[PDB]
Each structure stands twice: as structure tokens, then as C-alpha cells.
Symmetry: C4
Subunit: 164 residues, 4 copies
């Protein structure tokens, strides 16, 4: 029996009617790998009303993604408000982890000015983790030009961690 495609994404809800395999011992390895990923996504999601948030769920902000949203706010296109960009920034911070930044920080010569930005981003990541609503509120208070700098730095760090 082939693996049940519902079970591959989580739990088959079709009871005894379902004729596919729900028995992990007989599944090929690829299906067991795919299911772990869907399940990890669900577990992570299950352990995660503010201005600008609902806008990120609309058709064009979905297509932009959090990065497109933030890059758009920087270039003042696609109608991204500041509120939305701050919410998006919180989402970006949630996706980063400190340890990867510390690793970058450690490759810097001392008194490199990058070190200051790395530490700023690290503190944003930690604030965001403690209280993202608070962190978002702080971000909205920043002058536009410094917000955009901060975003841009965070975006550059996000790209560089991922190509190393």
C-alpha cells in the first residue's frame, strides 16, 4: 500500500474508509522525510489585533512576502504603510536566530562598525522573542529614515547568513 497523502501532511481523518497505508514501517523514506517537515511546521506554528498586521494577509502582500513588503517600504512603493512594515519586521526577526549573527560578529576585526549593527539586530531579535507586540511598537516610534536603515541591515544579514 502506498502512503496516505493525508497522513503525509499530518493525520488522516478518514477513519477505516481510507485504503492507504498509515503504517510508518512500510513507508518509503522520502515520505517519512516529507511528513516530518509538515509536522515540524505544525509544531512550530502551534507555539507562536495590532495595526498593519491584517494587511500582510492580503493578496499582494502575500505575493511580496515579508521581504518584498520590507523592500517595498524602503523604496516607498506598493502601498506599504509603516505599521505594516514594522509587523513584517517582527516576522523577519522571528525567522532569524542570534547564534548565526554572533557567528558573523566573530568573523569581524575589532572596532569594525558592522559589530555595532550585528549587536543592534541581536538585541531586536531578543526583544522580539520576549514580546513582539512591544518590539513592533518600538519600531513604529523610530524615525522613518532610521527604521529603513535598520530594516535594510536586517535584510542584508538575513541574505548573507543564508548564502553562508
Amino acid at each position: 500500500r502506498n502512503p496516505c497523502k493525508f497522513e503525509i501532511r499530518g493525520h488522516c481523518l478518514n477513519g477505516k474508509r481510507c485504503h492507504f497505508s498509515h503504517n510508518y514501517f512500510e513507508w518509503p523514506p522520502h515520505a517519512l522525510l516529507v511528513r516530518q517537515n509538515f509536522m515540524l511546521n505544525r509544531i512550530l506554528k502551534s507555539m507562536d489585533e495590532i495595526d498593519g498586521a491584517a494587511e500582510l494577509d492580503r493578496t499582494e502582500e502575500y505575493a511580496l512576502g515579508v521581504v518584498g513588503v520590507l523592500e517595498s517600504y524602503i523604496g516607498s512603493i506598493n502601498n506599504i504603510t509603516k505599521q505594516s512594515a514594522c509587523v513584517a519586521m517582527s516576522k523577519l526577526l522571528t525567522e532569524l536566530n542570534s547564534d548565526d549573527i554572533k557567528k558573523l560578529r566573530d568573523n569581524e576585526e575589532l572596532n569594525s562598525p558592522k559589530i555595532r549593527v550585528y549587536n543592534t539586530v541581536i538585541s531586536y531579535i531578543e526583544s522580539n522573542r520576549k514580546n513582539n507586540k512591544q518590539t513592533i511598537h518600538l519600531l513604529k516610534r523610530l524615525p522613518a529614515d532610521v527604521l529603513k536603515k535598520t530594516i535594510k541591515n536586517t535584510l542584508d544579514i538575513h541574505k548573507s547568513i543564508t548564502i553562508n
Copy 2:
């Protein structure tokens, strides 16, 4: 030594009496894949009202949540409205928004599917915040609109899974 079948499903509870391998470094890859699945199931389960207890009975277990809901829609197998609403909460828990958003994005604008996708998305998010509340709302819907909503959710569930 072959991997211990108890350890493959979680944790071997047989202490030193057990002669099988509890050492993941010597397991074949297939057994380490199977165990990860049983362990994820357990981790997910470990972080989880009228009509609920009924879903644990022999025939509702055989129907599954989808059988229960489909049965309610066709008024067979003695499924009460209360039970169907609980079962609907369980279906919503199994879905995720992001998959619906992805479907929503394939729609041409002003497609009437978009309205249903957004309705289901809001039910998923309510259910995640407070499933007891979401269930109570569902019980208040007129039977015919409840059945519509269930049916739409079921259809979305099926189509996500065949793409």
C-alpha cells in the same frame, strides 16, 4: 543488535532486561525515520464539552472526523449537531491557513471562492485561539449554513491534499 521496537515507538521501558539496541548510532536509517514520526506525533499530541465524548466511541472512531462530518451532512449514523461541531474544530486544527492562502492566490480576482477561502481561514484562526469558543459559534449556526461551511472546509481539505 536490531533496534528495539519499543524504542522505535518512543521509549523502551524494559530497563536492562531488553536485549535490543537502544543506541541510535547503530540503527539503520529506516528505523530512525520511523521513530521520528512516532515521536513527532507524541510531541504534537502533548501540546493540545457537549458532543466531544461521542467522537471517542467505536463507530465515530471508525468514521473518523471526516466520516462524522459527512454523516452529519447526510443525516446518517446518528451524528448530532454538537458532535459535528466538535469534529469540525478537529478538522480546522488539522488544516493550515498558509495552504489556503496559497489556494486563494491562484484565484482570479472577484472569484466567489475567495470569500469561502477567507471564511475558512478565519475559522482556522478562531479555532486556534479558542476552540471552545469556535465550537460554540458553530453550534449557533442554522443547520443549513453549518452544513455548507463543513462541506466547504471538507472540499478544501481534499483539494490541498491532492495538490
Copy 3:
């Protein structure tokens, strides 16, 4: 670089002094599979009374939960009732209801197994809600019925695992 054996079991704590690979992209698949298992064990552990401390002593550790329970049933190895009830809570935690429901469904109606399966299922669910409460209930049972219940739970545990 070979994978770091500390990272394989969790997180390497040796900073930059460690010369082994902490980069998953370069690991062989077996090491990535082994690490997932150690990390799942850690995640599960991180989201977890009279007779409890005894189960951590040298000989109860060697017996395992099942040894402890089997010992209590045969009145050997100095297992108190309190301990056996704690150990029973741990056995219940390791079982899951769905597997029992599957067994229950293979039974002809009015089979006396059905009554035991449902009893075990309700114990599993009580234990999941409140294991301290479930342990207290177990302590209140007459020895002879406790031993029956334990034995039934042990038999179900063995049969689910050989099918």
C-alpha cells in the same frame, strides 16, 4: 570535516575551539537522522509525590518501568504500591489511545476485552490530563484489582508493539 559528536546529541558547547563540523549541509544523512532523535527526546522531555524518587534508584532503573510493574505483580524486588502506581502513570504516558481504539475495533461486540480496552483508554486520558490525580486513584484501588489493571495494560503494551 566530520560531524561534531556533541552537536549530534544536541548543541556543541565548545565554541570555536571545536574543529568538527557544526554545519548540517555537510553532514552525512545518518548523523542528521541520529541528531533528530536525540533532539526529539529532548523536546519531549522538556514539556513534561510518594513512590516517585524510588524509581530513580539504581535497581528500579535497571528494572525499568515494566520490570518495576511486573515485580510489583509478583511481589518481588521490594516494589511498594506507591511506586507501582507512579510507574503505571509512566506506562500510560507511553501508550496511545488510538492504538487501543484500533484494537477495540477488531473485537466482536460484547467481547469482554472491550471493557478492558475502554478502561485502559480512560486511564490513558486521565493520566494525560492530570497524572498526579490518576496516580492517586490508582493508589486507592484494592491491590488485586490494581494488579489486574497493570497486567492488562502491560499486555496491551506488548501486543501493540508486536503489531
Copy 4:
């Protein structure tokens, strides 16, 4: 003729929406990429159920303590080098305890002949692991109260156990 997996998705969730040309579809990924992602995701799940409230903690995030690691920090405190305070060493010890698990120590304890003096250390470390798991802030406070020489002994024993479990 198909798409390579998205490197962002491999480390978590791609945040580039539809602009991204790489595959976000696990059904078409090679197994190695699915294996790598599971590891990044488990790290994230574990991190998300976890201190800068407490003295000595913030110091462990600085450039040189990061390079030393927890083990370097503890070994440095023992040898009185690299400017590790007692406070920091206690925080680091809490982190080391978090990484260990009791069951492995119990297994070591079971290999010992009775009245072996190792048994006493194994049980001390086991109780530290369990205290730390219940309340790490409390455990850290206790550790700060120990006389330096007994703290260093305890740290050293814990380090040795940590090494030996990992080479068996």
C-alpha cells in the same frame, strides 16, 4: 528539469513570497535537504520553549565568551583566566546541565561497583540536572553560594561526565 530547494526554506520558512524561484515543495526535494531542514526546525522548536534578568548571563553573549563556548568559559573559570567571573561560570554551568541528561548518567552509575566514590558524584550531578530543569534561576543562585573550590570541583566533574558520555 526541476527546481532546487530554497535555501531559505531549508533553514525555516522562505519569506520572499512568490518572487522566489526556488522550490518550496517538500515532495520534490532531495532527501538531504529535507534532513537538513528538520535539524534547523528542531533547533528552532527547542529554542522557542526556553536569563538576562540574572547576573553573569549577558557576559556569555559577548564576542570572546561566544568563542570560548560554555565549556571554554567553565574551563577558563577553573584556571582563573579570560576574565570569567563566578556569576558567569554559574550561568554557564546551568547551560551545561541543560545539555546533559540524567538517563545517561544513570547508565554510567549502573556500571559502577557499589561503594565506588564515582557514585556520589554521579548522584550529585544528577540532582543538579534535575534542580536545573525545575528552576534554573534557583540552581544558579545555589551554585553562586558554593565556596569557589567546591564549585570548581563540581564544574570539573560535570565537564568530565559530559566528555565521557559523548565518547560512549
